[PDB]
Design an enzyme around this catalytic site. Structure first.
Site, PDB file in Angstrom:
ATOM      1  N   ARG A 128      -6.382 -38.643  34.479  1.00 19.98           N
ATOM      2  CA  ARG A 128      -5.423 -39.255  35.388  1.00 19.98           C
ATOM      3  C   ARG A 128      -5.871 -40.472  36.193  1.00 19.98           C
ATOM      4  NH1 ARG A 128      -3.092 -34.360  38.625  1.00 19.98           N
ATOM      5  NH2 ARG A 128      -4.866 -33.195  37.752  1.00 19.98           N
TER       6      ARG A 128
ATOM      7  N   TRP B   2      -6.101 -41.852  24.909  1.00 20.91           N
ATOM      8  CA  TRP B   2      -7.240 -41.805  24.005  1.00 20.91           C
ATOM      9  C   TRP B   2      -7.890 -40.436  24.167  1.00 20.91           C
ATOM     10  CZ3 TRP B   2      -7.022 -45.833  27.770  1.00 20.91           C
ATOM     11  CH2 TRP B   2      -7.786 -45.623  28.944  1.00 20.91           C
TER      12      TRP B   2
ATOM     13  N   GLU C 272     -12.169 -32.581  22.799  1.00 20.58           N
ATOM     14  CA  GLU C 272     -10.906 -32.168  22.188  1.00 20.58           C
ATOM     15  C   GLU C 272     -11.062 -32.045  20.668  1.00 20.58           C
ATOM     16  OE1 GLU C 272      -8.584 -35.439  24.552  1.00 20.58           O
ATOM     17  OE2 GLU C 272      -7.095 -33.888  24.117  1.00 20.58           O
TER      18      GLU C 272
ATOM     19  N   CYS D 140      -4.358 -32.578  33.153  1.00 21.27           N
ATOM     20  CA  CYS D 140      -4.950 -33.798  32.593  1.00 21.27           C
ATOM     21  C   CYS D 140      -6.134 -34.368  33.385  1.00 21.27           C
ATOM     22  CB  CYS D 140      -3.869 -34.881  32.446  1.00 21.27           C
ATOM     23  SG  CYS D 140      -4.384 -36.447  31.673  1.00 21.27           S
TER      24      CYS D 140
HETATM   25  C1  HEM Z   1      -5.911 -42.158  28.445  1.00 20.41           C
HETATM   26  C2  HEM Z   1      -6.720 -41.072  28.387  1.00 20.41           C
HETATM   27  C3  HEM Z   1      -6.352 -39.716  28.448  1.00 20.41           C
HETATM   28  C4  HEM Z   1      -7.265 -38.724  28.335  1.00 20.41           C
HETATM   29  C5  HEM Z   1      -8.743 -38.923  27.956  1.00 20.41           C
HETATM   30  C6  HEM Z   1      -6.614 -37.467  28.662  1.00 20.41           C
HETATM   31  C7  HEM Z   1      -7.211 -36.203  28.449  1.00 20.41           C
HETATM   32  C8  HEM Z   1      -6.533 -34.986  28.523  1.00 20.41           C
HETATM   33  C9  HEM Z   1      -7.101 -33.690  28.194  1.00 20.41           C
HETATM   34  C10 HEM Z   1      -8.518 -33.395  27.699  1.00 20.41           C
HETATM   35  C11 HEM Z   1      -6.142 -32.771  28.355  1.00 20.41           C
HETATM   36  C12 HEM Z   1      -6.235 -31.273  28.015  1.00 20.41           C
HETATM   37  C13 HEM Z   1      -6.048 -31.148  26.514  1.00 20.41           C
HETATM   38  C14 HEM Z   1      -6.073 -29.713  26.017  1.00 20.41           C
HETATM   39  O1  HEM Z   1      -6.988 -28.955  26.383  1.00 20.41           O
HETATM   40  O2  HEM Z   1      -5.170 -29.348  25.245  1.00 20.41           O
HETATM   41  C15 HEM Z   1      -4.967 -33.484  28.794  1.00 20.41           C
HETATM   42  C16 HEM Z   1      -3.761 -32.865  29.099  1.00 20.41           C
HETATM   43  C17 HEM Z   1      -2.587 -33.543  29.474  1.00 20.41           C
HETATM   44  N1  HEM Z   1      -2.475 -34.926  29.574  1.00 20.41           N
HETATM   45 FE1  HEM Z   1      -3.917 -36.300  29.494  1.00 20.41          FE
HETATM   46  N2  HEM Z   1      -5.281 -37.668  28.975  1.00 20.41           N
HETATM   47  C18 HEM Z   1      -5.098 -39.051  28.790  1.00 20.41           C
HETATM   48  C19 HEM Z   1      -3.829 -39.654  28.768  1.00 20.41           C
HETATM   49  C20 HEM Z   1      -2.617 -39.031  29.013  1.00 20.41           C
HETATM   50  C21 HEM Z   1      -1.353 -39.735  29.106  1.00 20.41           C
HETATM   51  C22 HEM Z   1      -1.119 -41.224  28.838  1.00 20.41           C
HETATM   52  C23 HEM Z   1      -0.414 -38.825  29.500  1.00 20.41           C
HETATM   53  C24 HEM Z   1       0.974 -39.009  29.715  1.00 20.41           C
HETATM   54  C25 HEM Z   1       1.643 -40.165  30.011  1.00 20.41           C
HETATM   55  C26 HEM Z   1      -1.123 -37.570  29.631  1.00 20.41           C
HETATM   56  C27 HEM Z   1      -0.502 -36.364  29.939  1.00 20.41           C
HETATM   57  C28 HEM Z   1      -1.128 -35.121  29.904  1.00 20.41           C
HETATM   58  C29 HEM Z   1      -0.444 -33.874  30.124  1.00 20.41           C
HETATM   59  C30 HEM Z   1       0.986 -33.709  30.639  1.00 20.41           C
HETATM   60  C31 HEM Z   1      -1.353 -32.894  29.852  1.00 20.41           C
HETATM   61  C32 HEM Z   1      -1.160 -31.384  29.933  1.00 20.41           C
HETATM   62  C33 HEM Z   1      -0.372 -30.949  28.705  1.00 20.41           C
HETATM   63  C34 HEM Z   1      -0.236 -29.448  28.597  1.00 20.41           C
HETATM   64  O3  HEM Z   1       0.032 -28.797  29.633  1.00 20.41           O
HETATM   65  O4  HEM Z   1      -0.383 -28.921  27.471  1.00 20.41           O
HETATM   66  N3  HEM Z   1      -2.487 -37.693  29.351  1.00 20.41           N
HETATM   67  N4  HEM Z   1      -5.198 -34.861  28.904  1.00 20.41           N
END
Ligand code: HEM
Ligand code: HEM
Ligand SMILES: CC(=N)NCc1cccc(CN)c1
Ligand SMILES: CC(=N)NCc1cccc(CN)c1
Ligand SMILES: C[As](C)(=O)[O-]
Ligand SMILES: C[As](C)(=O)[O-]
Ligand SMILES: [Zn+2]
Lengths: 414, 416
Positions: free
Chosen positions: A121, A290, A295, A118
């Site tokens: 973070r 968000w 994406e 992610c």
């Molecule tokens: C608030 C803005 C957020 C943005 C812009 C963001 C953005 C991203 C992006 C671009 C990815 C990779 C997506 C992909 O290529 O499939 C990702 C993965 C991930 N995000 Fe975030 N994230 C945010 C919030 C969150 C929140 C609130 C959580 C959890 C409480 C979170 C948990 C994760 C996890 C666990 C992954 C990896 C999932 C996997 O292994 O498939 N994210 N995020």
């Protein structure tokens, strides 16, 4: 022992001492690196019909409780010792235990913080945590999910949130959300093996129809939710249209773009991942924040196995799709991502472009280097799908490892 | 299923199993505890200058392995010629501490080293490599002659041909043959009074070294550097490449007429010269190799990296884009036009070059050929996926297994 991490753009170097805290193994070995693999070969999450080794669970629980009291600056205090005894007492007699709501909130934020893939973070400390452990039916699951969506959407001013349903239990079925996200577009297989809608949701779309859903025939038909209470068949629930905020896509200067009839939902809410805190497992814990524009604009709309609109846009831009060297795909991709940003911004819906996002992640890396001496990061997932080297993270070396609390993949319930 | 890494392609939904990794005899930087696959220079293959002769026991096992590979390649494994060569190598090492390769063994090994390179996306061309044997070279001046001939042959007036020149191997006690420059063609980087750099910031150290060695510096942005060639136990000698031998391409854009006014350019021949070629335990400290460019190397990395020519802002300003905000995607827009200019210009100048789409598509073909031929292909995802338009190419969606196979090209410490 400790990895020397270098940034090639600035020539700065740091050492990751946090990786020493890792207790869970990844897929790599000295013989070969498997970091590019999306899912684990064995790091999956085997069934829970039998109680997990008390000693193992207990050591994990103790570490978590230790982390918690350390966060509230009360390590060693009386409360800390009494809590460890409680957990100890409950595991020894029942083979499991339960988290206090305060610990759950801390645990959820920590799992996000530890998520290597992610890029957003920097927001880890700002997460609304809805305790749904007091849920005993799919109907109730539906109500919690609708409230999560309403709160998280907030009329376009998105707020990160997570709703936690009951933890897994020995010899008992899991609470599960069958859909991979709370909002998904249907994928309908047509006569000649082609697909109308999102090709990634064909299977789920079929399960929904199989379970009584009356299918539509559009390119962006919001799917209904299949929610499952322990050992029961999943139940179908249709999300109230007014709760699903969507953004019509148009281009800032290309008047014809809007005519493509493209659109995308505002809320990215992963619902198929497992949240593990202190050895406890939450098989249903949908989370959302968000979108980062790539994406939608790059992956969802341009991936070959997704909506694959590159050539359509290219042709509308009257580009030379006769050869690769004209870079027609690159040009179309950029305008599509531009349309996404412009549209969300026009509809006043929260979104972040890949440059802003990566810049904030570099800041996060620095904050984490000082706070914890390192930050687990998965390079292939942190670097955006377009303009990779045009962003700072591309030139930043990263160390990838597993810390707990953590979000993990789990088997499809069917 | 099979007890080997399961590799999936998420675009086609197809799966393969890598059984070739089972042949790796050299460890990488990763462990079950953490993945260090993104590190550019992990202290693994790092061929630190090993003065004292190599453990005759370790050298022989490596040599035997290579001979087995060679005889396997010609389909004579287990034959009398195979066993005799093995005995000849062990004998030679016994009385001298080292051994030498036959002509064909060197050719086989050089090609395998390229074939085994995890970070090279151009490996579909691996079987087509002109191998110049220069193991008779005995002076820096002679190194220059060999290098000039390599450049002439490889450049072939624009119709580039892959080639590698192999100088004498490292010898116990004696100094190494070395080419100080990281490439045969590089642009000088001149440190300015204000602290900035004119030219290529990547080459500040080498530029200073050339100066310290008698080179009279220029003051341009694209001054081709001279070569610092080093023969065993001698200070490095300075050689200036004749301009007529260094083919360059002035950059212009197909539609943006003003781009030509920027005065940008790049050379046609990408020839890496600081890598060590290892074959059956033998180490060739000087073995410059070259192919042709993939446009993103020039257009995206060399010209747009922050620590390189960093021309993104200049071009965006020329395109009148809003560089005051990220959401305008001005960086993305300018990078695209810069890459198009590179492809356009090289095509115009009739100089061989391959765009990132064509290259990645050919690498996918290579992966399929290798799956059938060896049961896998070592690949470094981060280096295989292009620096721009990543997911628009087929390699992005292909999972890859990375491991070290020998013969191989390895990094080695700088001579100074
Ligand atoms: C608030 C803005 C957020 C943005 C812009 C963001 C953005 C991203 C992006 C671009 C990815 C990779 C997506 C992909 O290529 O499939 C990702 C993965 C991930 N995000 Fe975030 N994230 C945010 C919030 C969150 C929140 C609130 C959580 C959890 C409480 C979170 C948990 C994760 C996890 C666990 C992954 C990896 C999932 C996997 O292994 O498939 N994210 N995020
Ligand atoms: C035929 C044309 C060729 C193309 C288009 C090609 C393309 C590439 C590219 C794009 C890279 C990564 C560049 C970077 O990010 O710095 C690379 C790396 C590499 N290539 Fe190829 N290559 C070609 C020929 C060769 C030849 C002939 C050899 C050797 C015999 C070779 C050996 C390697 C090696 C060892 C690396 C990795 C070096 C490192 O770790 O920095 N390539 N190639
Ligand atoms: C919150 C966000 N922007 N992205 C999270 C995510 C969405 C879909 C698949 C995997 C992760
Ligand atoms: C031959 C080629 N296109 N690329 C190889 C390469 C060039 C510069 C630096 C490192 C590798
Ligand atoms: C807009 As055109 C089809
Ligand atoms: C085009 As110039 C400023
Ligand atoms: Zn790894």
């Amino acid at each position: 022992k400790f990895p020397r991490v270098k940034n090639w753009e600035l020539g700065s170097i740091t050492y990751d001492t946090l990786c020493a805290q890792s207790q869970q193994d990844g897929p790599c070995t000295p013989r070969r690196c498997l970091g590019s693999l999306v899912l684990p070969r064995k790091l999956q999450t085997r069934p829970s019909p039998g109680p997990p080794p008390a000693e193992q669970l207990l050591s994990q629980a103790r570490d978590f409780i230790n982390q918690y009291y350390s966060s509230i600056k009360r390590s060693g205090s009386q409360a800390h010792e009494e809590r460890l005894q409680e957990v100890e007492a409950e595991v020894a007699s029942t083979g499991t235990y339960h988290l206090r709501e305060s610990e759950l909130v801390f645990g959820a934020k920590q799992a996000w913080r530890n998520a290597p893939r992610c890029v957003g973070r920097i927001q880890w400390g700002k997460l609304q945590v809805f305790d749904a452990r007091d849920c005993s039916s799919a109907q109730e699951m539906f109500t919690y999910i609708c409230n999560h969506i309403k709160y998280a959407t907030n009329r376009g001013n998105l707020r990160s949130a997570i709703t936690v349903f009951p933890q897994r239990a020995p010899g008992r079925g899991d609470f599960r959300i069958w859909n991979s996200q709370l909002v998904r577009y249907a994928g309908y297989r047509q006569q000649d093996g082609s697909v109308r809608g999102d090709p990634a949701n064909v299977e789920i779309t079929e399960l929904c129809i199989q379970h009584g859903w009356t299918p539509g025939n559009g390119r962006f038909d919001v799917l209904p939710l299949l929610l499952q209470a322990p050992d029961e068949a999943p139940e179908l629930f249709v999300l109230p249209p007014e709760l699903v905020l969507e953004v019509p896509l148009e281009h800032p200067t290309l008047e014809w773009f809007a005519a493509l009839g493209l659109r995308w939902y505002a809320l990215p809410a992963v619902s198929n991942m497992l949240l593990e805190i202190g050895g406890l497992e939450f098989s249903a814990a949908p989370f959302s924040g968000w979108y980062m524009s790539t994406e939608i604009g790059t992956r969802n709309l341009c991936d070959p196995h997704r909506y694959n609109i590159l050539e359509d846009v290219a042709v509308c831009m009257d580009l030379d799709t006769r050869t690769t060297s004209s870079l027609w795909k690159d040009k179309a991709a950029v305008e599509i991502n531009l349309a996404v940003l412009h549209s969300f911004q026009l509809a006043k819906v929260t979104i972040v472009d890949h440059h802003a996002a990566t810049v904030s992640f570099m800041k996060h890396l620095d904050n984490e280097q000082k706070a914890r001496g390192g930050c687990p990061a998965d390079w292939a997932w942190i670097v955006p799908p377009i303009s990779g080297s045009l962003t700072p993270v591309f030139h930043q070396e990263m160390v990838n490892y597993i810390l707990s609390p953590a979000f993990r993949y789990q088997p499809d319930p069917w």
